[PDB]
Amino acid sequence: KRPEDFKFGKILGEGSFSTVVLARELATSREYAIKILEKRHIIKENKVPYVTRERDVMSRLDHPFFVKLYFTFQDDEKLYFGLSYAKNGELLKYIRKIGSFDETCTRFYTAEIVSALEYLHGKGIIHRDLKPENILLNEDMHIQITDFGTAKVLSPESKQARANSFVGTAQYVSPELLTEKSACKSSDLWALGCIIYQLVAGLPPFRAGNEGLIFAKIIKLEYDFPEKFFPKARDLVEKLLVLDATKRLGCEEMEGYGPLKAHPFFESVTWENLHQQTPPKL
Ligand SMILES: c1ccc(Cn2cc(-c3c[nH]c4ncccc34)nn2)cc1
């Protein structure tokens, strides 16, 4: 494909070295979110690892709750990644707007994230930057998870469990990354715990005016629940926000996703056809 194969529209996101722009493919009339990277910039900033990594990770993804990579092309100066377009924006936008999700909405969107992570972890991949800003909503209001630049493919051949790069967003970073200096699949489950808490409480659990203060609270597991927090959701959060990464519900050591999906908070959930169910109105 060539850039001339598309008509570009509004900018969907501006990054430090890349931009995402809405595009319509002329020959088919389909809409894509195209991620564009300046080739000169990548070499200068040594962002190539982030770029090559992202292509290979996304090439492995084929699940309804993840952004799909449809095509990639290049011209003398730029790299283009054709991605799924999610019309309804970030999950964060809705948390801020509504303030906090009711129990039905909390359960439904938490279940979709759990289903997504079960797939991703099954493929041996750690997102490492899960947060509401990276959980988009498509036209039907189902989730689409994006931003795989920070993602890691763990090697099957050495039964790899740990990733060493320090990446992520402070409010959602796991204690093991801060103290042991490495992350694992279970690090995404810590982030899930923060996200569930945020859907109900309106803000993430560890929050402060700067990163260092946040890190200090994470390491000490210093947070509180607001009054009226749904009880079964509270129990689930307490089973995810655990300092020991081998003791989080859903992690390999705790025998995987089955026990997590079996949590009482999810009792009314039908897991199989989640992506075809009608989302509860927010
Ligand atoms: C540069 C790097 C990363 C980002 C964040 N981002 C948004 C998206 C995205 C994929 N499909 C979409 N559809 C609508 C809006 C945003 C997106 N992927 N990554 C924005 C700019």
UniProtKB/Swiss-Prot annotation:
Single GO MF annotation: 3-phosphoinositide-dependent protein kinase activity
Keyword field contains ATP-binding: yes
Sites bearing Phosphoserine, chain numbering: S165
N6-acetyllysine, modified sites: K228
Superkingdom as given in the UniProt entry: Eukaryota
Subcellular location: Cytoplasm; Nucleus; Cell membrane; Cell junction, Focal adhesion
E.C. number(s) listed in UniProt: 2.7.11.1
Protein name as catalogued: 3-phosphoinositide-dependent protein kinase 1
Included stretch of the parent chain: 77 to 358 of 556
